[PDB]
């Protein structure tokens with residue numbers, strides 16, 4: 001249920017393959033920020049979720065460097081997949097920038113993205 | 120040459136990681152705490168061309184807490200930066216999401232912060 | 240704008256008064272968790288926000304002790320009051336529990352609550 | 360043991376009074392950011408904590424407006440007090456700025472501050 005194309009509330013595009021081993025692989029294209037075109041992502045998911053109708057825990061990382069831009073920063077999304085007719089991946093995220101020590105206190109943004117199958 | 124190696128956090132967890140030339144992080148994680156035993160697979164990304172102005176190197180990785188022995192139906196992501204030099208450090212904040220029922224989703228996610236050094 | 244009765248996505252009820260000095264005062268009733276009836280809250284807001292279409296920054300705290308229950312924990316909500324389709328307060332929150340030192344790594348839950356004035 | 364002056368790892372100064380009803384009142388002075396002099400804070404704490412060595416849960420808020428300056432932002436610290444010879448207040452915090460709706464995705468910084476008595 002995880003493999004495919006997903007879209008968040010900003011209009012970003014998350015293209016992922018869930019491997020049998022628990023691997024997540026794919027690309028991310030952000031609608032916002034210091035970003036253009038696609039970025040590599042990798043992550044992990046629970047390949048044997050609870051069979052009580054609980055979500056499937058997962059997470060992935062993008063480092064914001066590709067052949068076009070380098071924003072010296074990385075986002076991790078941590079969340080859970082919920083299947084069915086309105087399938088969703090509900091996440092919270094941490095976006096850490098490379099900073100000097102003096103500016104480390106303001107290195108990290110936090111937010112929340114909800115992914116669905118329709119934009 | 121800096122990130123690759125064996126790291127330990129303030130809890131005594133062990134983070135064995137290899138930084139690829141392509142920006143990949145690969146390795147294993149063993150937690151000293153929680154619903155975990157032995158090693159778990161990790162993967163992540165890092166900035167392979169960091170600034171040269173004294174800024175840290177941004178990185179992140181994920182562990183799903185399923186291995187051959189146990190499954191805690193949960194995943195942690197660590198987001199942070201590597202700080203080079205004589206006492207190299209990886210300073211992170213993390214999000215640990217559990218798979219929940221819809222009605223318990225409000226309490227799905229723990230947050231914390233881990234600092235790693237190469238000292239056992 | 241801020242003064243009034245708000246409801247989040249869980250059906251919790253946030254009754255607040257925005258004072259002229261930047262004070263927030265009122266009560267919170269959670270629909271979920273180790274909580275019953277109303278709890279005291281206090282907080283602060285920007286009493287001279289920008290006039291460029293930006294939101295109004297604010298935050299508040301509830302300690303989960305009242306006359307009925309004590310959950311040995313406190314939540315802070317940090318967010319902004321916004322206009323748009325309807326009046327809304329968009330937050331992220333941190334819920335810290337009092338823990339032993341050994342359990343402090345799992346002391347803090349994180350989430351996000353959006354409030355409107357619409358009674359469910 | 361909460362009432363008094365506390366200092367974090369940035370060199371900021373947290374002056375607080377813990378009232379018998381669970382109130383926190385005081386002033387905060389940040390060593391960093393868009394901040395000058397002292398700001399009002401208010402918050403709440405667990406006035407009947409467990410007696411098993413567990414910390415005392417608490418939180419407070421600063422809106423970054425005072426008579427000198429206005430940074431159109433607010434920080435909330437959520438954490439626990441731990442007493443004893445090496446007393447600490449261990450926190451995580453959320454700093455939200457007032458933004459346009461288009462910029463709301465980047466409204467909020469997160470971090471962690473440890474306060475000590477010394």
Ligand SMILES: O=C(CCCC[C@@H]1SC[C@@H]2NC(=O)N[C@@H]21)N[C@@H]1CCNC1
Pocket residue numbers: 008010012029030031032033034035064071072073075093095097111113464
């Ligand atoms: O702007 C960047 C990179 C792009 C971040 C895009 C973010 S990821 C979380 C959120 N969900 C999305 O779909 N899009 C946004 N980095 C900055 C450099 C300095 N500070 C940080």
Ligand SMILES: O=C(CCCC[C@@H]1SC[C@@H]2NC(=O)N[C@@H]21)N[C@@H]1CCNC1
Pocket residue numbers: 128130132149150151152153154155184191192193195213215216217231233344
């Ligand atoms: O306990 C678990 C899995 C193990 C987490 C270990 C955590 S990762 C962040 C922190 N840093 C470490 O080095 N260790 C801890 N998951 C639970 C199931 C129910 N809720 C959640």
Ligand SMILES: O=C(CCCC[C@@H]1SC[C@@H]2NC(=O)N[C@@H]21)N[C@@H]1CCNC1
Pocket residue numbers: 225247249251268269270271272273274303310311312314332334336350352
């Ligand atoms: O369950 C509690 C107290 C009640 C928390 C209710 C939370 S506040 C954030 C969210 N938004 C709401 O409107 N309701 C929930 N505390 C536990 C002791 C053990 N761990 C934690």
Ligand SMILES: O=C(CCCC[C@@H]1SC[C@@H]2NC(=O)N[C@@H]21)N[C@@H]1CCNC1
Pocket residue numbers: 105367369371388389390391392393394423430431432434452454456470472
């Ligand atoms: O710089 C500001 C206000 C000052 C924040 C200081 C922060 S509070 C958390 C941390 N712990 C401290 O003791 N100091 C720092 N606000 C900005 C306007 C734009 N974005 C954000």
